[PDB]
Design an enzyme around this catalytic site. Sequence first.
Site, PDB file in Angstrom:
ATOM      1  N   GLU D  45       0.832  -1.175   0.000  1.00  0.00           N
ATOM      2  CA  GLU D  45       0.000   0.000   0.000  1.00  0.00           C
ATOM      3  C   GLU D  45       0.894   1.262   0.000  1.00  0.00           C
ATOM      4  O   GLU D  45       1.913   1.317   0.702  1.00  0.00           O
ATOM      5  CB  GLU D  45      -0.822  -0.033   1.284  1.00  0.00           C
ATOM      6  N   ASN D 108      -6.824   6.207  -2.101  1.00  0.00           N
ATOM      7  CA  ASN D 108      -5.781   5.284  -1.716  1.00  0.00           C
ATOM      8  C   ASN D 108      -5.936   4.149  -2.714  1.00  0.00           C
ATOM      9  O   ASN D 108      -6.935   3.404  -2.676  1.00  0.00           O
ATOM     10  CB  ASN D 108      -5.996   4.804  -0.279  1.00  0.00           C
ATOM     11  N   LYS D 125      -9.228   2.086  -2.398  1.00  0.00           N
ATOM     12  CA  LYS D 125      -9.520   1.527  -1.086  1.00  0.00           C
ATOM     13  C   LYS D 125     -10.908   1.890  -0.579  1.00  0.00           C
ATOM     14  O   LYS D 125     -11.235   3.071  -0.366  1.00  0.00           O
ATOM     15  CB  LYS D 125      -8.488   1.976  -0.070  1.00  0.00           C
ATOM     16  N   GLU D 144      -6.611   8.590   7.431  1.00  0.00           N
ATOM     17  CA  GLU D 144      -6.992   8.134   6.099  1.00  0.00           C
ATOM     18  C   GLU D 144      -8.347   8.654   5.624  1.00  0.00           C
ATOM     19  O   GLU D 144      -8.514   8.930   4.445  1.00  0.00           O
ATOM     20  CB  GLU D 144      -6.969   6.608   6.056  1.00  0.00           C
ATOM     21  N   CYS D 170      -4.846  -3.123   2.404  1.00  0.00           N
ATOM     22  CA  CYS D 170      -4.655  -2.986   3.839  1.00  0.00           C
ATOM     23  C   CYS D 170      -5.872  -3.452   4.634  1.00  0.00           C
ATOM     24  O   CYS D 170      -6.155  -4.640   4.675  1.00  0.00           O
ATOM     25  CB  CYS D 170      -4.290  -1.538   4.178  1.00  0.00           C
ATOM     26  N   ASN D 195      -0.013  -1.039   5.463  1.00  0.00           N
ATOM     27  CA  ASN D 195       0.844  -0.398   6.448  1.00  0.00           C
ATOM     28  C   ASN D 195       0.072  -0.614   7.717  1.00  0.00           C
ATOM     29  O   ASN D 195      -1.022  -0.075   7.846  1.00  0.00           O
ATOM     30  CB  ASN D 195       0.916   1.105   6.190  1.00  0.00           C
TER      31      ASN D 195
END
Lengths: 302, 302, 302, 302
Positions: D45, D108, D125, D144, D170, D195
Amino acid sequence: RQMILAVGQQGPIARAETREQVVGRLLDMLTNAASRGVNFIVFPELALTTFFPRWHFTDEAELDSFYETEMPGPVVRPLFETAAELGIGFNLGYAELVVEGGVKRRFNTSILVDKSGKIVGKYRKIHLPGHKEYEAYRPFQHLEKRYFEPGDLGFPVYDVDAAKMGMFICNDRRWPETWRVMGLKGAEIICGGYNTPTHNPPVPQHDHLTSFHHLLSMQAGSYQNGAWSAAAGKVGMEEGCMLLGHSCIVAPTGEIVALTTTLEDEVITAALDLDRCRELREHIFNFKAHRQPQHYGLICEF
Amino acid sequence: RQMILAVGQQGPIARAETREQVVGRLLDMLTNAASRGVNFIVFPELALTTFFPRWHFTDEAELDSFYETEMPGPVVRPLFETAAELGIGFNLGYAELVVEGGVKRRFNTSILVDKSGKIVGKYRKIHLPGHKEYEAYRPFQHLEKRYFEPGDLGFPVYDVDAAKMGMFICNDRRWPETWRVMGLKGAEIICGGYNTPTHNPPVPQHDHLTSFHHLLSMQAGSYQNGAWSAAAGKVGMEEGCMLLGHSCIVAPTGEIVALTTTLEDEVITAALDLDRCRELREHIFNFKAHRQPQHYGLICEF
Amino acid sequence: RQMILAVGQQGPIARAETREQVVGRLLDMLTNAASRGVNFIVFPELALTTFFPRWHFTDEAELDSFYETEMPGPVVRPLFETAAELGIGFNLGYAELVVEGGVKRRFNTSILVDKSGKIVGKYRKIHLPGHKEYEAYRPFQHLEKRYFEPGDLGFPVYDVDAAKMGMFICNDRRWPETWRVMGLKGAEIICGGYNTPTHNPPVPQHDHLTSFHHLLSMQAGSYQNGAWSAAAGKVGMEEGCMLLGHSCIVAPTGEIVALTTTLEDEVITAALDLDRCRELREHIFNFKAHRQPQHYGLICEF
Amino acid sequence: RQMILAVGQQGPIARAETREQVVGRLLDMLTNAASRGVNFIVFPELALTTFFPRWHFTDEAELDSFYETEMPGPVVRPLFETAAELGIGFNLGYAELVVEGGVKRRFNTSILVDKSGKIVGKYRKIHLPGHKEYEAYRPFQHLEKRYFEPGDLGFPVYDVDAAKMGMFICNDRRWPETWRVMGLKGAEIICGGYNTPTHNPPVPQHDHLTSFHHLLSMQAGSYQNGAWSAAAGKVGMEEGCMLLGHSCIVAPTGEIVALTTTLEDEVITAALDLDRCRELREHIFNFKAHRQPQHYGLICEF
């Protein structure tokens, strides 16, 4: 200092599959091993024949046919020839019969062979599992104690090319002592093979822990001694007996870094740092700093 | 032959929390245990005080206050008395200070108390982890080697009511030798406590393996010796240092049959059949049939 | 908000063992559980008889014998009576036979009984594993699809005393959707039982993974919904077919907090705290904050 | 139907480390992968920058600098060229900045690039973790939801050379729904990066389950859908924050077949038979035979 380690798992070997047929199978596994860039590959316990200790033998000549009277014979030689040609080392398990003044010595044996195709080391199974004599109730016997005598080489460690390597065979991996003795001689890698039926007739209530007990043994031994380990199995349904898979490579932390998923011939590999061992051996398991052997005496009493 | 074993895990103990306050918490876990049919409860390592070995002390009287000059003192006597009327035995851990022959002896100690309330036996930590002198490069200190000397009682096995019971303490569990010595002595339950930080300053790249290594150690120790085991942690965020939870009870097979999920005071229990050891000790790990002490010599050399 | 939860694992039940005998075994476990402070107990799937779906029945009357036409019937009554007087709830699975609107319906059923003793809720197995027609090329049959129809209640969640409880039966536990439907209704405990053969004739190469896949499913389900789960096996060698042990209790984090080790009648317990669900449901798995059902549509298309 | 799969884990990227430096780190890895005989390699990611959502941003221009306005820029272009010429496919994560009539879209994002250097698919994402506003007590933020919007492509599956591949990113792995949507589109491989801090400030009591949780999510997802999975982490101490390692490749049975042991740039590999999926998807999880989507409706409500 860095190297690529592999496990050459085998599927079943039929009662009458010829050694030449099995060498061919082993030969292909080197092939796949150059393709993943491998320096040393570990093959299974008794890797040239079916697992004969499942049968109760009455005829000596028959029994002897499953042992090697030399290593390598003409049949197995191509395996070595090719090692010295491609420069890959290996751990090979076999049945060793030696004749000493007419007396036959029977050993469950494994050897270490280097990039140059030289036998640089031998081990002989010390912890022989199974039972003393024939038991009718069992679907298969485990007659290792009758067909082999316990090895007389101790648990040695050998330089194999760049690395210090110890050997275990099968049930050996379940004894912390196996690992500790080689840990104490500075093994960086401890490898061997096995044949582990997923069914144990005397204690069938542990059948469902077979993979568990196998993995627990490797992870613990590795961790406790800061050694890499590899376990090559002969696996799947051999002569109506189901053998455990889960051949693996283990880091000095106890972490499993490669695992097989099939019950057939299968190459797994892992990247190996011979100084990784120091994360344990220069620290939490710094033997010189932490072990108290003065207080371990009972372990060596006999 | 069958009992209910318990682990009384401790949440953090503050530097300012009094021994009385801690014994009250212990009393609470005891009565909770009783409500759940418990015959024996394992308590943590150094269970009376915060974990002082994490600080460097320059005043000696201040260092000494953390130790017991008697067991039980009047503050701890309530734990023994209550345990006695309830018919619950326990494993209690503490810092012991004894003066013999002009020497202040300092030990990391545990005692076994049977259900009648008799102190039945003692162990003193043999494997001390950490370092001896203060180290600058460290977040917190780990000075067990400074504040304790190795135990002087070996690894004993004692009869506790119906069972053969050995103790380990914290880091001891990581050594196969600890287990094997009590196994050779016929221990049926092996138990003790721990303080295990989730961060390790010399090797923080194993931090995420804290639970892995802790359970691998108990499970493998138990399996290889056919012993029940119980491991009582002192856990949670204690004086800025996070301590591992996962207090547990383990079967002779290596299976975890009870495990804590909180980081606070908590009691887990499991049903306990002493004869289950037989499953391993009369079979796969029959020491008399299988063990090979004569090749294990390097383990006891010092 | 706090309770002690039990699982009541059963060893095998023979073809000729009687409902009254099996109820006898169930009462004993019930008795053992009360001594350990248990508030609620989970019993296995088809807890009243042998695993009949393993055989091909041609005589519709003998097939019907394995089913209950009422609940409780006279034989099962004592289980209800006792649990009610102790104040201990239970989950019981059974084969259900009901006739409605000219149709003879057969269900794989489980019920929740509260501690005052009213049947609070029923669930009928929705995911029937195995096959519909006799299959010669498999050693034992698995005829659940023949002997049951998929359940007509959805996946309900019921208020049982202080707790929101949902049920699954056996193969249900392997489907993330089972867990999620109940997760979305606020289940705090999801419980049920199973008969899981350690051999699987279509895919025998997964046989050594039986415990793995069983535990994987429980642990993932519990964690992803923040629910305590409990799984009661009927286990051991039954009518020539071996069934998986490893009954267990699981915390909202997916940690196994109690596990069985015998293949026989066995009670295990665990303190459950219903607020521990918040750790996942008010945080990482807060469905309101995080879930994106706008993108899940394909899951519901039929 | 066969191929080799790699995970190219990253060690930390520092806040001021440049994209040219990072691409060079990834190039090294793409190179090794060929030496090891890899067909497709998975990268983490946000693999082009330090993990910037750990900080509260007060300057838009500074925030924008962590994003790609094109894929590839002149800097990332060599990665595309070398992979195409070496004939190796890859999955790369990065922060996507898109402008639509002056409106800025932030994603993302991860893309699939086939052997020929062609971008065959994109995923953005969908499950964004953490919080939305600055929280002062935390040693690092997880912002995020502030710096990206939920992805708008759903969970697609794409033809990549020989394979049908799905991407997750993720936190997505923790959601059964991620896996199931792609399972239902026939993914044979489901891959992505992460992460994952080992410390979670609001729920620190699960810190020591970080590996447990990450692996559990991976294994269950794979098993439930009969899909190979690969997860590439960016790991180690990055700008003061410890990021979880244990990047891995997982078989359709949920068996881990490769695992990283360092916290630095590390390449792992696995032999994948795209037909192994059949073991699950035509038997225990034969969707057509067994799934009951009629009863799953609550899952898709919003």
